[PDB]
Design a binder for this molecule. Structure first.
Ligand SMILES: Nc1ncnc2c1ncn2[C@@H]1O[C@H](COP(=O)(O)OP(=O)(O)OP(=O)(O)O)[C@@H](O)[C@H]1O
Ligand SMILES: Nc1ncnc2c1ncn2[C@@H]1O[C@H](COP(=O)(O)OP(=O)(O)OP(=O)(O)O)[C@@H](O)[C@H]1O
Ligand SMILES: Nc1ncnc2c1ncn2[C@@H]1O[C@H](COP(=O)(O)OP(=O)(O)OP(=O)(O)O)[C@@H](O)[C@H]1O
Ligand SMILES: [K+]
Ligand SMILES: [K+]
Ligand SMILES: [K+]
Ligand SMILES: [K+]
Ligand SMILES: [K+]
Ligand SMILES: [K+]
Ligand SMILES: [Mg+2]
Ligand SMILES: [Mg+2]
Ligand SMILES: [Mg+2]
Ligand SMILES: [Mg+2]
Lengths: 186, 187, 185
C-alpha cells in the first residue's frame, strides 16, 4: 500500500482511538507541534553528534518520549475505549529524569541572574530554537488538558523540557567557551 | 515607493483581490505558513546542494508550486484560484520512484538520518502545519481543494525523501525505543 | 533555586504586571513567537559570524530589541501600573534605524523583485526563514495592539523587521556571489 492513502485529502484525519476529526482540530495542532519539536531536536542532534558534544543520547531519549507524548495526545479521552487508555496514561518518570539532568548541568554553570540572548554557538543557538518550539508545543497542549482530553503529565513534561533545553544550551555554550550575552534596556 | 510602504503599520494588509483584512486573518496565516515552509525547504536545499544529491531541482520546483499555493490562498473566492492537480500527480510519481529504491518501512523512525534528512523532517512538520492552516479555508469554500491535497501529498514526499537521502548517504536513522526510567510501563 | 519552580505545571504563567493567565493566552503566544524569532536569528547569526560579516552586529542589536519587544508584550497595558511604563513604552527609534539599514543595502542591490524563491546560499536562506518567522510574530502581536494591550510601535517594528530580513538576505547572496533562484510557472 502506498504511503499516500488519500483518505486525508478532504481535510479529515484519524486519532489513535479511531475518532476522525478535521485536521485543524486542537488534537492535530498539538500532535503536529510536538512532531515539529522532535524534528527541530533531530536537527540539533546532528550538530551535537558532529561537533563532539556528548549529550546526544539524552536528546535521542527525549525524542522517544516525545513520540509517547504524540501518542497520548492522539488518544483523546473523550473518544477512548478501555483498551485505548493504555496510551493516554503518560507516566511521570521522564519528568524526574529531566530534573536530574537539569541539576547535573546546573552544578557546572554560573548562576543565572538576568535574561540572556539566545546565542552561544551553533549548537546552543539551535537548542534555544528547540526551546522556543517546545514552549509553543506546551501552549498547544494546555487547552487539551483543560478540556480533560489529555493527562496533565504531558504538559508538565513539556514545561520541564523547555527548562532542560535552556540549560543544555547554556551548557553547550560554556563548553565551547562562549560567554553568555546579557542585555538590559536603558 | 520603497520596500516599506507602511500600509501594513496599523495591522491590516491586502489580499490579491485588493481586500483589506487584519494581518491575523486566516488568509494571512495560511499564506505566511506556506512561505515559512518554502523558506525551510530553501535552507534544506542549501544542504542538499553542498552534499551533491540528485533531487535539488525537485525541491526548487516544489518551491515554485508553493508560490502558486500562496497566490491561491491570497485570492479568496469570497472577494475574487484555479490550482490544477498536475503538481499532486507529479509528487506521487516522485514518491513512487524513491519508494522503489527503499525497503518497506518496518520500524518507527525518529526524525533523524543525517543533517539533510533531519532538515527534511523539519520541513515535513512545517508542511503539516501549513496543511492545518489551509484546511479551514477549503472547508469554507475560500480555497481550491487541490491546495490542501498538494500539501497533504507534500509531507509524504518530504518523509520519503528524508529516508531516501539517509540511504544514499549511508546514514543510520534512529528508531523508537521505549524510554521508561522509572519502570512504570506495563506493556 | 531550581529553574523548574513547577508553578507553570498546571498551565498558567505570570505576566510582568503580576497577572496569572493560561499559557495559551494571546500574550504568551506573542511573547513565545518573538522568542522563537530571536532564537532563529541567533542561529542565523552563527552562520554569519563564521563568515565574519559585519552585519552580525546588526543581528545582535536586533536580538536586543526583540528582548524589549518581549518585555513589552509581557507587560499588558490592561494591568500595567505607573512603574511598568519602562517596559510598555516602545519608541520609534528602532524602527527608523531599520529603515536606514534597509536604505543602505537597497542602494547596493539590483532592482527589487517579488519573484525570488527563498535561496541564495546558507546565510540568505536562513535569513528568509527568519523573515517568515518574523511575519508570524507580527500576526501574533497585531491582535494585542487592537485590544489596547501593546504599543502600536511594537507591531510596526516587526513589520519593518521582515523587510530588513528580506533585504539582508538579498545582500548576503550578493556578497557571496550567489545567484538567487527565480520562480518558474
Ligand atoms: N496536517 C497534519 N497535522 C498534524 N497531524 C496530522 C496531519 N495530518 C495527519 N496527521 C496525523 O498524523 C497521522 C499520519 O498522517 P498521514 O498523512 O498518514 O494521515 P492523513 O493525512 O490522514 O492520510 P493521507 O496522507 O494518507 O491522506 C494521522 O493519522 C493523523 O493522526
Ligand atoms: N505578517 C504577515 N503574515 C503573512 N502574510 C502577510 C503579512 N504581512 C503581509 N502579508 C501578505 O504579504 C504581502 C506582502 O507583504 P508586505 O510586508 O509587503 O505587506 P504589508 O505589511 O501590508 O505592507 P508594508 O510592509 O509595506 O507596510 C501583503 O500584501 C500581504 O498579502
Ligand atoms: N509555554 C510558554 N510560551 C510562552 N511564554 C511562556 C511559556 N511558559 C512561560 N512563559 C513566559 O515565560 C516566562 C518564563 O517561563 P518559565 O518556564 O520560567 O515560567 P513557568 O512555565 O510559568 O514556570 P515553571 O517553568 O518554573 O513551572 C513566564 O513567566 C511567562 O511569562
Ligand atoms: K500519508
Ligand atoms: K503556530
Ligand atoms: K513591505
Ligand atoms: K502557523
Ligand atoms: K522555569
Ligand atoms: K548548518
Ligand atoms: Mg516553564
Ligand atoms: Mg515586501
Ligand atoms: Mg497526510
Ligand atoms: Mg509588511
Amino acid at each position: 500500500p502506498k504511503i499516500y492513502t488519500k483518505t486525508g485529502d478532504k481535510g479529515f484525519s484519524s486519532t489513535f482511538t479511531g475518532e476522525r476529526r478535521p485536521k485543524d482540530d486542537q488534537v492535530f495542532e498539538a500532535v503536529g507541534t510536538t512532531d515539529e519539536l522532535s524534528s527541530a531536536i533531530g536537527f540539533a542532534l546532528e550538530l551535537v553528534t558532529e561537533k563532539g558534544h556528548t549529550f546526544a543520547e539524552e536528546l535521542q531519549k527525549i525524542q522517544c518520549t516525545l513520540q509517547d507524548v504524540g501518542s497520548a495526545l492522539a488518544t483523546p479521552c473523550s473518544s477512548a475505549r478501555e483498551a485505548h487508555l493504555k496510551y493516554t496514561t503518560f507516566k511521570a518518570g521522564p519528568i524526574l529524569e529531566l530534573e536530574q539532568w537539569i541539576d547535573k548541568y546546573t552544578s557546572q554553570l554560573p548562576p543565572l541572574t538576568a535574561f540572556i540572548l539566545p546565542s552561544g554557538g551553533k549548537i546552543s543557538s539551535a537548542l534555544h530554537f528547540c526551546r522556543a518550539v517546545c514552549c509553543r508545543a506546551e501552549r498547544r497542549v494546555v487547552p487539551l488538558v483543560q478540556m480533560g482530553e489529555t493527562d496533565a503529565n504531558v504538559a508538565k513534561f513539556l514545561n520541564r523540557l523547555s527548562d532542560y533545553l535552556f540549560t543544555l544550551a547554556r551548557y553547550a555554550a560554556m563548553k565551547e567557551g562562549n560567554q553568555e550575552k546579557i542585555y538590559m534596556k536603558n
